């Protein structure tokens, strides 16, 4: 496959990247505490945030609401609304790097997680932490809500990916269902197919791990081997039966879904990958590297 790129920014190094639903936008999450607001279609920088000290690894943006969430190596999980362009409120309680944070797609929910071994639900009407979910042993690297059920999946340097159950807290409130054991070393990342019941796993044992999962059970069901340093990122293509990742290697690498083999390498000369994400709907992706972020499609080789 070829990757024709759309847009390319320049900056100091880019943890995170969101894609707005609708508007042609991303926000980017960079190492020097600030978050960026471009078009990538017209190449434009639309507004800069600055409400963080340090690297700001967490950004996402809510799928309906004028809202979008950033999660700091100040521990805080900060709302926004970007219409008034006003940091609404801080969301206090982890101890240590916040790592991810995300929206529910229904519920009025902020998922987070942290280096200080947590998961925590808030609920950003309220402002209040509704759940705080323990039993990882190491930094909580990754965590996702799942799309049409009450799970969560989360990946973790104790060298786990855990799904918990939380059908009680959206009626003891979260219980973990699954801890899922194979990765040899820690676990950076962790992603739900947005249809099928599958689930992704990449970590510093270099491994993408593709998962299976049932009402009561789950299996591993093959490992994506080739790259050659951590792998900071995967994710399910949602409209080809394709996988990706993004590691320290300095490349991304799309795989076969059915039978995990590579199918195309791209690689950059200096940067290391941190971050890969796909707009919802558009065969439209984002890689966020040691020297800024690039939005790109994915074409088949000769077309």
Same mark, same amino acid.
Request: hydrophobic residues 35%; glycine residues 10%.
């Given at each position: 496959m070829e990757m024709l790129t759309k847009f390319e920014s320049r900056s100091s190094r880019a943890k995170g990247v969101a894609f707005h639903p609708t508007q042609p936008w991303i926000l980017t999450s960079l &190492?020097?505490?600030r978050i960026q607001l471009w078009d990538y279609r017209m190449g434009t %920088?639309? !507004?800069? /945030? !600055?409400?963080?000290?340090? =690297?700001?690894?967490?950004?996402? /943006? &809510? =799928?309906?609401? =004028?809202? /979008? *969430?950033?999660?700091? !190596?100040d521990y805080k999980v900060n709302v926004w609304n970007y219409k008034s362009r006003k940091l609404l409120f801080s969301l206090?309680? &982890?101890?240590?790097? *916040?790592?991810?944070?995300? /929206?529910? &797609?229904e519920y009025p929910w902020i998922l987070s997680c942290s280096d200080d071994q947590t998961i925590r639900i808030w609920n950003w009407q309220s402002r209040n932490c509704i759940a705080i979910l323990t039993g990882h042993s190491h930094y909580v690297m990754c965590a996702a809500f799942h799309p049409?059920?009450? %799970?969560?999946?989360? #990946?973790?340097?104790?060298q786990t990916v855990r799904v918990w159950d939380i059908s009680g807290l959206r009626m003891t409130d979260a219980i973990v269902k699954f801890v899922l054991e194979g990765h040899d070393r820690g676990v950076n990342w962790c992603a739900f197919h947005p249809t099928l019941p599958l689930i992704l796993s990449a970590g510093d044992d270099? %491994? *993408? @791990? %593709?998962?299976?999962?049932? #009402?009561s059970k789950a299996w591993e069901v093959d490992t994506c081997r080739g790259h050659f340093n951590n792998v900071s990122c995967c994710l399910f293509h949602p409209h080809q039966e394709l996988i990706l990742s993004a590691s320290e290697? @300095?490349?991304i690498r799309v795989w076969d879904l059915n039978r995990r083999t590579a199918v195309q390498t791209f690689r950059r000369d200096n940067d290391a990958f941190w971050f890969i994400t796909v707009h919802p709907k558009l065969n439209l992706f984002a890689a966020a590297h040691d020297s800024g972020v690039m939005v790109f499609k994915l074409e088949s080789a000769w077309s």
């Open positions: &190492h020097n505490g %920088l639309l !507004d800069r /945030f !600055d409400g963080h000290d340090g =690297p700001v690894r967490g950004i996402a /943006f &809510h =799928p309906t609401q =004028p809202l /979008f *969430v950033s999660g700091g !190596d206090c309680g &982890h101890m240590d790097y *916040v790592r991810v944070c995300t /929206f529910h &797609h049409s059920e009450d %799970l969560i999946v989360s #990946a973790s340097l104790d270099r %491994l *993408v @791990k %593709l998962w299976r999962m049932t #009402a290697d @300095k490349t």
